[PDB]
Structure formats: C-alpha cells, structure tokens
Amino acid sequence: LDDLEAKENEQLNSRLRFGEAEPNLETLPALPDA
Amino acid sequence: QKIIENGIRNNEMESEGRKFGHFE
Amino acid sequence: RVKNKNPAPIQISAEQLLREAVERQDVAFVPPKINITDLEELQ
C-alpha cells in the first residue's frame, strides 16, 4: 500500500496524526552480537 | 590351578609394572 | 574502550553451542586395577 502511494505521488493522514508503530519484539531480526 | 597361578603372576608383574612404567 | 559494538566476524551458532557443550565430557574413569596376589583375593 505504501509503495502504491509513493507511485501515486509521481503522477499526482489518519495514520500520520500519531507516531510510528512500535515494532513487535518477536518479529524483528535478532541483534548482531558485539 | 594354572589359571590361578597365571592370575597371580600377572597381578604381581603389573604391580611391579607400576614402578616399571612409572616414568616410561 | 569496551565499546566495540562491531558485529563479530564469527557468530555463535547452535551447533557450536552443543559441540562446546559435549567437549565437557572426558574419557571413562580409570580406576587402579585391583591386584590379586594370593588365593584369598581370587576367591
């Protein structure tokens, strides 16, 4: 959907009024070890 | 009899083999 | 500086975990063999 919106802008808010979605902890890739 | 005596000899040799193979 | 957050060139893998777990085993225990110097310890 976001990619379609981006291509929509080339030839041419409800989620925007609040901050970005905090990611789910269990679905993110593992942090590389130091 | 010989099997007993062989066991006794082998145990004696290994017991002195502790000193024999002490350093190798 | 204990602040080298660079990702390690080698990453800990599961198989490494289990291999370095099993390295903790040693050979079977070696007891001093009993010596039978007369008929008593034989019987």
Side-chain angles (χ1 to χ4, degrees), chain A residues 9-26:
Chain A
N9 288 348
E10 282 180 348
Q11 80 276 351
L12 280 78
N13 181 25
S14 189
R15 193 233 79 72
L16 168 65
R17 49 195 157 171
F18 281 100
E20 302 296 311
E22 289 77 4
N24 190 353
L25 275 59
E26 321 285 19

Side-chain angles (χ1 to χ4, degrees), chain B residues 4 7-12 14-15, chain C residues 33-39 42-43:
Chain B
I4 313 152
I8 303 169
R9 299 182 270 295
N10 290 313
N11 286 289
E12 183 72 4
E14 65 178 295
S15 65
Chain C
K33 196 160 77 71
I34 303 100
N35 270 306
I36 301 99
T37 51
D38 72 4
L39 66 77
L42 177 68
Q43 289 262 332

Side-chain angles (χ1 to χ4, degrees), chain C residues 2-38:
Chain C
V2 289
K3 195 147 289 274
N4 57 345
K5 313 316 289 171
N6 163 38
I10 65 165
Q11 308 273 261
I12 302 91
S13 81
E15 62 158 35
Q16 293 173 350
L17 294 173
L18 297 174
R19 79 171 54 259
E20 81 172 282
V22 58
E23 62 96 13
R24 291 178 182 273
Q25 198 187 358
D26 47 357
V27 292
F29 201 78
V30 174
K33 196 160 77 71
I34 303 100
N35 270 306
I36 301 99
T37 51
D38 72 4

